[PDB]
Amino acid sequence: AVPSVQTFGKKKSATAVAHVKAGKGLIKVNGSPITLVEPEILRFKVYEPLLLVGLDKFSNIDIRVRVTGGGHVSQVYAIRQAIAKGLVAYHQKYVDEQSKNELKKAFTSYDRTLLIADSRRPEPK
């Protein structure tokens, strides 16, 4: 019944599903808040989808992320990818396309690996 949006963030074998919907503004990773995501030195790697665009985008929506697999740093990279492209997809579908591609421009100017992973490797020289 609610406007909701589901995205995916992947690094090596971690995978994070982020559901974004309209709400009061709560960002929850694995049930716990976002301010508990260990190893606590990469908590700003998790935070930078919020601090790159401002918390006034997150003031009206609530995100929840479920992260399985991987290790510590692969899980924080999956979390930040899921949060970033979930915010982009929510502003695409339920807010205007101008804020959509402003968010895409800001995340892509920081690093496009917030939005597109580096996936299939190696190179056979």
Partner RNA sequence: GUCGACGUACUUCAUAGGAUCAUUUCUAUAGGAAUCGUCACUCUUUGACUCUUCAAAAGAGCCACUGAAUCCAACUUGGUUGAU
Partner RNA sequence: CAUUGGUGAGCAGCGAAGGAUUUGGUGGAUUACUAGCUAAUAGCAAUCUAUUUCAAAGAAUUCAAACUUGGGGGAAUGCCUUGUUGA
Partner RNA sequence: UGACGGAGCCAGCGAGUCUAACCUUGGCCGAGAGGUCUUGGUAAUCUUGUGAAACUCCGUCGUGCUGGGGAUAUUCAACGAGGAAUUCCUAGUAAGCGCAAGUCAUCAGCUUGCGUUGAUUACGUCCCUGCCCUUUGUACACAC
Binding residues for other proteins, per CB under 8 A?
5-8, 66, 85-86, 88-89, 92-93, 95-99, 101, 104-105, 108, 112, 115-116, 118-125
Q: Minimum Å distance from CB 25 to RNA?
A: 12
Query: For residues 67 and 79, is the Cβ–Cβ distance under 8 A?
Result: yes
Q: Minimum Å distance from CB 44 to RNA?
A: 14
Q: What angle do CA 113, 46, 37 make, to 5 degrees?
A: 140
What is the C-alpha to C-alpha distance for residues 37 and 46, in angstroms, rounded to an integer?
A: 8
Pick the piece of the chain touching RNA (CB under 7 A) from 6-14, 49-57, 87-95, 99-107.
6-14
Q: Minimum Å distance from CB 118 to other proteins?
A: 7
Report the site for RNA in 10-29 (rule: CB under 7 A). Answer: 12-14, 19-21
Q: Minimum Å distance from CB 40 to other proteins?
A: 27
DSSP string, 73-125: HHHHHHHHHHHHHHHHHHHHHTS-HHHHHHHHHHHHHH-GGGTS---S-----
> Angle, to 10 degrees, between the axis of helix 72-93 and the axis of helix 97-110?
150
Which residues in this chain contact RNA in the complex, by CB under 7 A? Answer: 1-2, 4, 6, 12-14, 19-21, 31, 38-41, 62-64, 68-75, 121-123, 125
